Design a protein around this nucleic acid. Structure first.
Length: 462
RNA sequence: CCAGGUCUCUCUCGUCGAA
RNA sequence: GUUCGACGAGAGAGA
């Protein structure tokens, strides 16, 4: 993805966007108990911690496009993936305005406590001034649809969140692109039946993990993979996507009965963004905050492995490839081992910079012992081998607890951590419970015991 | 005082409804 | 007491 141009807003006719410069993360009563290195990431340009220039570094993700045409491999992959997607047999209908607004079977409601996007943000209007979950009133929305129409500029926000050290002084913060209420609704009316069918079909069929619940679905996964495994990591997936991939996506969309709306995709590689007092244009790159960015990023990953397979292993049957993607994250298998190192090579020739799985330094064979999905390991239960635990290493469960946004929520924060932590096992779980109860409000919490989480975990298959 | 995207899953709270 | 459902708000994690 390339920035095509960028200039002061006041002379493109777009308003100056004012954004907060103070983080909402204060240290917690557990800050000095556990250990960890992550500070809140950089928000403004004057941050005392900075090594480099701010603005220069956060837009650095926009690599520059690489391809423009869909080649014979991409074209091939398209038919296979689309071919595969066909068995799903998924409703091609437009979704009605009421649904796409207020939720329906497979799709939640719009998020009524987040920005409404341009123009509303600057006109002083929140989603709740337009939406009402009780009345379920379209109309006033339909108005603002007819006024402002669609294809509006995104509002670019710095993401308020904890981040490693090397990435703070290096100013490698993350950017949010707030979709306009108007486009979210439009997008959902066009694709909110596609959305629902990926949501209810996570697996090697869709090649997507959206909708799945790792507590349960971790057991279905070994079953679905083939013999030898392969996997990698990406350096800035969303921003490295060249427009040609949007074309391969649209072909797949065309193939399965979405012909009409497939020009909506164009609104994604070509797009306009508002950032404080400037305005800019970007060609390529999937923007953060659109509707469906989760699902589209997955589909394109499914296409990236099929292409890079065909390319690098000349003569290969794609029907024996089982994968699941969650955006750029992915778990992947094959009958015979494949060399992720080769793909990474024959792959920068597509704009994608690939690396080894789990911040490794060398493409090592992928085993059920060192593989991760959604930052969790796989470990079979001692007493019941067929039931797999998703295991998140305590390292960054630690990092999350040393910090809060509102101490009034400490009970809920920590109890969520416990539901993640216990899969490490009774020892480390109680070990953890011990360091929590060693400050006054630690002792006061209401925390479950290993036995209670283990019982319930098992019951949840019954 | 507020400001800060799209989703997915879970948990907690509050409402009405259930022998 | 607790369970169960529907519907609203909060929060955590993951992409």
């Amino acid at each position: 993805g390339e920035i095509q141009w960028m200039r002061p807003s006041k002379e493109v006719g777009y308003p100056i966007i004012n954004a907060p410069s103070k983080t909402k993360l204060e240290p917690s009563a557990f800050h000095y108990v556990f250990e960890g290195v992550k500070e809140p990431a950089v928000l403004t340009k004057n941050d005392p911690r900075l090594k480099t220039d701010f603005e220069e570094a956060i837009f650095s993700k926009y690599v520059g496009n690489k391809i423009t045409e869909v080649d014979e491999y991409m074209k091939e992959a398209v038919d296979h993936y689309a071919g595969q997607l066909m068995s799903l047999d998924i409703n091609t209908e437009q979704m009605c305005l009421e649904d796409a607004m207020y939720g329906t079977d497979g799709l939640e409601a719009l998020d009524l406590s987040t920005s409404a996007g341009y123009p509303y943000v600057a006109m002083g209007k929140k989603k709740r001034d337009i939406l009402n979950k009780q009345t379920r009133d379209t109309k006033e929305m339909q108005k603002l649809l007819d006024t402002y129409g669609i294809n509006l500029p995104l509002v670019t926000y710095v993401k308020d969140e904890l981040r490693s050290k090397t990435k703070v002084e290096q100013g490698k913060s993350r950017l949010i692109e707030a979709s306009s209420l108007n486009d979210s609704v439009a997008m959902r009316m066009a694709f909110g039946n596609l959305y629902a069918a990926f949501h209810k079909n996570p697996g090697v069929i869709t090649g997507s993990a959206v909708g799945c619940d790792p507590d349960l679905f971790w057991s279905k996964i070994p079953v679905l993979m083939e013999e030898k495994l392969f996997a990698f990591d990406y350096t800035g997936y969303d921003a490295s996507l060249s427009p040609a991939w949007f074309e391969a996506l649209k072909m797949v969309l065309e193939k399965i009965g979405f012909g009409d709306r497939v020009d909506y995709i164009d609104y994604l590689n070509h797009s306009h963004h508002l950032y404080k007092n400037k305005t800019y244009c970007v060609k390529g790159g999937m923007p953060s905050g659109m509707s469906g960015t989760s699902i589209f990023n997955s589909m394109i990953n499914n296409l990236i492995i099929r292409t890079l397979l065909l390319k690098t292993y000349k003569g290969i049957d794609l029907d024996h490839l089982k994968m699941i993607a969650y955006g750029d994250d992915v778990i992947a298998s094959y009958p015979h081992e494949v060399d992720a190192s080769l793909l990474a090579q024959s792959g920068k020739d597509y704009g994608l910079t690939m690396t080894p799985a789990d911040k490794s330094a060398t493409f090592e064979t992928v085993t059920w012992e060192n593989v991760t999905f959604l930052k969790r390991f796989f470990r079979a239960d001692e007493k019941y081998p067929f039931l797999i635990h998703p295991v998140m290493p305590m390292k960054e469960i630690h990092e999350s607890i040393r910090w809060t946004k509102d101490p009034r929520n400490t009970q809920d924060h920590v109890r969520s951590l416990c539901l993640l932590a216990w899969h490490n096992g009774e020892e480390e779980y109680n070990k953890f419970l011990a360091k929590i109860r060693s400050v006054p409000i630690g002792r006061a919490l209401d925390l479950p015991e290993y036995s209670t989480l283990y019982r319930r975990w098992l019951d949840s298959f019954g």
